Design a protein around this ligand. Structure first.
Ligand SMILES: Cc1cccc(C(=O)N(C)C)c1C
Ligand SMILES: [Zn+2]
Ligand SMILES: [Zn+2]
Ligand SMILES: [Zn+2]
Length: 459
C-alpha cells in the first residue's frame, strides 16, 4: 500500500451540481479518464494523479489550495483561485486579474507555482474541495506522463514547454507553459457533513469568505492543515533539509545555554522549573540550582492555560526561583520566567501559513504553532543581546580586527581590551543569535534581569 490505487472508490456526490448525472459508482481510473487524461498502463513513477492523506502529509510544503468558480463550462469564463491569494480569469474564446485565454493563463500558472514552490518542494499538491470545474479545467494547464528530470539540472520535472518540447524543475521553468505531473487530493473524500465554509469556520476565524475562488482555495488548505496537523499530530515524520535547519537548531541550543547560565549567575535562583518537552535535558549541566522538570508536549491548537499547567495540586511553589518555558507556549507567562516563543508571523521557507492565526513550522518535523500573542508577555520584557564568557583568555590554534562592545561581558573587557579568543567567540555567538531571531524565535525575561550583575562574577 505505497500509493493510492486508481481502482479506489471516489465519492462523486460533491461533483453532481457542476456535473449532473455523474455515476455514484466511480474510481480514480474513471475520474482521471473523465478529466481528459490517459494513463496508458504506465509504470513510470506516476501511478495516479491523486494521492493518499499520508502522502499529502509527507509533502505538506507542496500544498496549494485550488478552486474554480463559474463566472457565467466551455461556453462561460472560469475564475481560478489559488491559496497564494491569486485569482486568474480564463475565457474559452485577493489579487483579481481580468479575462484572458488559456494559452496565456497557463503561462502565469507556471510562473506563480514556480516562484512559490522552488525553495519549498520538488512538486505541487493541489488541495481541493472538489465540485467539478477544477477537475474539468486541469486539462487546459496540466500535462501528465512518465516521471522525468529537468533539462538544465538533476531535479525531477514539474513543468513542460510546448515551444521547445523540453521539461524543467521549478528553478528552470522560465517561459514554460504546462504543469507536468502535478499531484492532488480531494478533502471532500475524508468524510465531512456540510459545505467548505461551515467546516472551516468551526476551527478558524482568520480566513473570511469574500466569495472569490482564492478565498475558498485558502479555506480548503487551512482545513486540510487543521485535520492533519492541529487535531492529528505525528512527530515521527521526518522532512528533508531545504535551508538553514541545522544552523538554526544549533543556534537555539547555544542561545539557551547562554541565557539560562547568565540568569543563574545574575540572580542565583535556588530552584529552576523546567516546563516543556518531556525529552528535555538541563541546558546548563554544571549549574548549582535544583533542576525540576514538568512534561508538556508542544501545543498545536490553543496555547496552554497557565492555570492548568501550574494548578490542581514538583516543588508545588512555581513562585520560588525561576520558570523556564523554552518553546512551551502558554497564554500568560508568570513574572519569574525565561521564555523562548516562536513568532508565527515570521516569513521563511520553514514557516508555512497555518490555521486560526497559527503557522506550520517545518524543521525536521512539522509543528503547528498557535498564533503569536503579545499579551502573553505582560509580566516580562524582551531579553536584550549579550555574550557572557567566564572561560580563560587563551587563543590556541581566521584574520582579525579588534572588538569593542559593551555587551561582551568578559574579564578581558572588564580589564580594558577584549582578547582574540573572546572576540572570535563573541562574533560567532552574535551570528548564531541573529540566525535564531531571523528564523522567528523571540526571547523574553523577568523584569529584574540586568547584565550589570554579571561583572561581579569575575573577581
Ligand atoms: C528546495 C529544496 C532544497 C533541498 C532539497 C529539496 C528536496 O526536498 N528535494 C527532494 C529536491 C528541496 C525541495
Ligand atoms: Zn532544474
Ligand atoms: Zn482558516
Ligand atoms: Zn578574553
Amino acid at each position: 500500500p505505497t500509493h493510492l490505487s486508481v481502482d479506489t472508490k471516489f465519492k462523486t456526490e460533491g461533483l453532481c451540481v457542476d456535473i449532473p448525472g455523474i455515476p455514484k459508482d466511480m474510481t480514480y481510473r474513471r475520474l482521471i479518464s473523465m478529466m481528459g487524461f490517459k494513463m496508458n498502463y504506465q509504470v513510470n513513477g506516476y501511478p495516479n494523479m491523486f494521492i493518499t492523506r499520508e502522502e499529502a502529509i509527507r509533502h505538506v510544503r507542496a500544498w496549494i489550495g485550488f478552486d474554480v468558480e463559474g463566472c457565467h463550462g466551455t461556453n462561460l469564463p472560469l475564475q481560478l483561485g489559488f491559496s497564494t491569494g491569486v485569482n486568474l480569469v480564463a475565457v474559452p474564446t485577493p489579487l483579481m486579474y481580468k479575462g484572458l485565454p488559456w494559452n496565456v493563463v497557463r503561462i502565469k500558472i507556471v510562473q506563480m507555482l514556480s516562484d512559490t514552490l522552488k525553495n519549498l518542494s520538488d512538486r505541487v499538491v493541489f488541495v481541493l474541495w472538489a465540485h467539478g470545474f477544477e477537475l474539468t479545467s486541469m486539462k487546459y494547464f496540466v500535462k501528465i506522463g512518465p516521471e522525468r528530470t529537468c533539462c538544465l539540472c538533476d531535479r525531477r520535472a514539474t513543468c513542460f514547454s510546448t515551444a521547445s518540447d523540453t521539461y524543467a524543475c521549478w528553478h528552470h521553468s522560465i517561459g514554460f507553459d504546462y504543469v507536468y505531473n502535478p499531484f492532488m487530493i480531494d478533502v471532500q473524500q475524508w468524510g465531512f457533513t456540510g459545505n467548505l465554509q461551515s467546516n472551516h469556520d468551526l476551527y478558524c476565524q482568520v480566513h473570511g469568505n469574500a466569495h472569490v475562488a482564492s478565498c475558498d482555495a485558502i479555506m480548503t488548505r487551512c482545513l486540510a492543515v487543521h485535520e492533519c496537523f492541529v487535531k492529528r499530530v505525528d512527530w515521527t515524520i521526518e522532512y528533508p533539509i531545504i535551508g538553514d535547519e541545522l544552523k538554526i537548531n544549533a543556534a537555539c541550543r547555544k542561545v539557551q545555554h547562554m541565557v539560562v547560565k547568565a540568569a543563574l549567575l545574575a540572580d542565583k535562583f535556588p530552584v529552576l522549573h523546567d516546563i516543556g518537552n518531556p525529552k528535555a535535558i538541563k541546558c546548563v549541566p554544571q549549574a548549582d540550582v535544583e533542576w525540576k522538570f514538568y512534561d508538556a508536549q508542544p501545543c498545536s491548537d490553543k496555547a496552554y492555560k497557565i492555570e492548568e499547567l501550574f494548578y490542581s495540586y514538583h516543588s508545588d511553589k512555581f513562585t520560588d526561583g525561576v520558570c523556564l518555558f523554552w518553546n512551551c507556549n502558554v497564554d500568560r507567562y508568570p513574572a519569574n520566567s525565561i521564555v523562548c516563543r516562536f513568532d508565527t508571523r515570521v516569513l521563511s521557507n520553514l514557516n508555512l501559513p497555518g490555521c486560526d492565526g497559527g503557522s506550520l513550522y517545518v524543521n525536521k518535523h512539522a509543528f503547528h504553532t498557535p498564533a503569536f500573542d503579545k499579551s502573553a508577555f505582560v509580566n516580562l520584557k524582551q531579553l536584550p543581546f549579550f555574550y557572557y564568557s567566564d572561560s580563560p583568555c587563551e587563543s590556541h590554534g581566521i584574520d582579525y580586527v579588534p572588538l569593542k562592545s559593551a555587551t561582551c561581558i568578559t574579564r578581558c573587557n572588564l580589564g580594558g581590551a577584549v582578547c582574540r579568543h573572546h572576540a572570535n567567540e563573541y562574533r560567532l555567538y552574535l551570528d548564531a543569535y541573529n540566525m535564531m531571531i531571523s528564523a522567528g524565535f523571540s526571547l523574553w525575561v523577568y523584569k529584574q534581569f540586568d547584565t550589570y550583575n554579571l561583572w561581579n562574577t569575575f573577581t
